[PDB]
């Protein structure tokens, strides 16, 4: 009745698990098991949410577990216990297999290939928590059990890629739990979490398993960003060598996004800009990825205003995000006019929203940038312009004061002018004729190398699957 549903779901898990199990027995493989595993990842979520909650319990009991069943059952008793389908034929069989973990073979103990099955059990329970959307203690129980289970053996290459996804969910529930509410107990537990992250990474270094390391790098960077220890993060990003190999296109997207935040705080607005446009192009378009994309687009707009580049007006209208980016739309206009008065009003008015996204910190820095941007307009519109006239437009107080502002802004060399003190005006030196200079040479040189590197990336990718078709039988 209820058992029928559990049994349909159970069989689903087993075929994906059985397939992989054969693959890793021939020699540990990475990307071929990963493809299967990634599809199973989605499946477990859609069945668990929509269909029962002791549906996880049935599979876990049926296989030979090391303690995992005990760990699952505690959670369910609390929310109203289910003990049904722990009866023979659901606690006696270990699920039909040919010999790989077959019921007879396993009970007799000629084999105990519990290994992959144990990893999959961890994934089911962790997913089921996130699907339920419950935090506090349920999270703490998940963290305590699974972390030392995996570290009392040196994982083989194949098992290791599974446990990176386990490290993710533990961390995410913990982080949001701290962001639920300030608690004196939440606070002390974050030091506990911090320690484990870096230790996981060191294991991932030893086996040079590329996707394990990359995923772990993301979590460390996220936690730094939330605690405001960017100082501690500057060092960390300097000692990266990020793999671009076995990764998922989701891993690569997150990575470039994290550099941009750190970069912005280190007043790297130049490399930050490429990195955020890069992150979006790996990242899928979907409503499933929307909260990721939002934060990326907010980050991008602000980066441009800090350059003085000024985002397009177009960016805000054509996106289906106009409400979320609504403050950024008004910031773009504020800097455009050079308006202190508008700008001060915009960032106060929207303060809290900005404060949630942790971009409130970036916005206050734009107060300088209204002044610098104001002066770049003024040097374009007028070749020679009195000191007083400038004061009218930007609501300034003295001639001497605006002279300091321009003096500093052209030390950054944005305005491309030079100040006449003795005559009372500011005279631009812009006249181009830079096609008589050697400048175009440099620019052309860079484009060519980018083109050549695109060839190299065509080479590594194209011929690699060709080889495989000669290897496999299809004649």
């Amino acid at each position: 009745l209820h058992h029928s549903e559990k049994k349909y779901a159970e069989e689903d898990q087993v075929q994906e698990l059985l397939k992989v199990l054969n693959e890793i027995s021939k020699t540990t493989l990475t990307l071929d098991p990963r493809y299967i595993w990634r599809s199973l990842k989605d499946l477990s979520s859609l069945r668990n949410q929509e269909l029962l909650n002791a549906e996880t319990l049935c599979f876990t009991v049926n296989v030979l577990y090391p303690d995992s069943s005990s760990f699952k059952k505690n959670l369910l008793k609390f929310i109203t216990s289910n003990h049904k389908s722990s009866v023979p034929g659901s606690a006696e069989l270990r699920n039909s297999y040919p010999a790989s973990f077959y019921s007879v073979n396993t009970e007799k103990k000629t084999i105990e290939v519990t290994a992959e099955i144990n990893c999959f059990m961890h994934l089911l329970v962790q997913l089921f928590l996130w699907d339920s959307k419950e935090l506090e203690q349920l999270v703490e129980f998940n963290r305590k059990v699974v972390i030392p289970n995996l570290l009392c053996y040196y994982n083989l290459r194949s098992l290791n890629l599974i446990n990176a996804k386990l490290w993710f969910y533990i961390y995410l529930s913990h982080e949001t739990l701290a962001r639920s509410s300030e608690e004196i107990n939440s606070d002390n537990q974050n030091i506990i979490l911090r320690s484990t992250m870096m230790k996981f990474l060191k294991i991932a270094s030893l086996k040079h398993d590329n996707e394990t390391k990359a995923m772990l790098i993301n979590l460390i960077l996220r936690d730094f960003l939330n605690n405001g220890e960017v100082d501690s993060a500057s060092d960390f990003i300097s000692k990266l060598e990020y793999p671009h190999t076995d990764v998922s296109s989701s891993l690569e997207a997150r990575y470039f996004f994290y550099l941009s935040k750190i970069n912005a705080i280190q007043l790297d607005y130049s490399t930050a800009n490429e990195y955020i446009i890069a992150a979006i192009r790996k990242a899928p378009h979907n409503s499933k990825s929307l909260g990721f994309l939002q934060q990326s687009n907010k980050l991008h707009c602000c980066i441009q205003l800090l350059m003085g580049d000024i985002p397009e007006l177009s960016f805000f209208h054509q996106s289906n995000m106009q409400k979320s980016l609504l403050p950024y739309y008004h910031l773009t206009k504020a800097v455009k006019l050079g308006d202190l008065k508008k700008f001060t009003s915009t960032i106060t008015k929207y303060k809290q929203l900005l404060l949630k996204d942790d971009t409130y910190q970036l916005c206050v820095r734009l107060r300088s940038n209204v002044i610098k941007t104001g002066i770049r307009i003024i040097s374009l519109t007028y070749k020679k312009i009195s000191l007083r006239d400038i004061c009218l437009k930007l609501n300034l107080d003295s001639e001497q004061t605006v002279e300091y502002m321009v003096s500093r802004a052209i030390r950054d060399g944005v305005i491309e002018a030079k100040i006449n003190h003795e005559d009372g005006f500011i005279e631009t030196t812009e006249l181009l004729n830079i096609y008589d200079s050697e400048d175009p040479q440099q620019v052309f040189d860079e484009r060519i190398k980018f083109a050549n590197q695109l060839h190299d990336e065509y080479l590594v990718s194209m011929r690699y699957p060709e080889d495989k078709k000669t290897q496999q039988n299809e004649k």
Binding site: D187, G228, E229, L355, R367, S368, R411, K418, N452
Partner: protein, 266 residues
Amino acid sequence: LTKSLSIAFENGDYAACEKLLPPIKIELIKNNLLIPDLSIQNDIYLNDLMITKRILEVGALASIQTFNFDSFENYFNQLKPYYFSNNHKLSESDKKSKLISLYLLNLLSQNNTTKFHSELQYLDKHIKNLEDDSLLSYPIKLDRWLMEGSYQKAWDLLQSGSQNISEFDSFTDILKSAIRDEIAKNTELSYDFLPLSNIKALLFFNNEKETEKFALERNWPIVNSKVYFNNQSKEKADYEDEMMHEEDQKTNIIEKAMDYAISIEN
């Protein structure tokens, strides 16, 4: 030991505190050890935790005024874990708000804003709206007036930061000095000609001899009361070349074509 330092500090001597602190560092090994490092806090470790903060807190305050910025920071870093966690149980403190105001000023006088913003991000999650801004406001306001480069507003704020006679007046002098150097870089781009009167205002000097004093040390050739900043630009540009990187910094016509060629023939 702990109390002997205590009473040195209240008298008004900080040269007294400093001499007697290396004895107190020994006993600070014990105060860090009696707490298990915040892995669990109780009302037993709350008593212990008070000893550990209090000893570092006064040692840190003393350091500023004997112009031992190095020692001031050494103590501040030790404070950081108690401030970091267990908030809503003696981790938020009156002394904590005062002490962050000064710490921020120490970093800004290093003239790295890179560090400043990174610390600033941490203060958001902690007290910055919970004990609000009224003296934690001051180091941020100052940073803003230098990044935009309104130096009248900046000089004003430091001027009013000399009515902050306790230990805040000790970072103010460094920051009036730094500003003179800042504008002197700027004026290379802006000008090539200034009279003496125009130089005097911009570098925030009130004495003519002080302007000519800086001009010798900053290596401005003021001859006939007029500067020639274009000489000064040459030096700074020339310094950027002199460092050996120098083949590919200039970038050879010949070398581009060679590069292009080999990639095709790889």
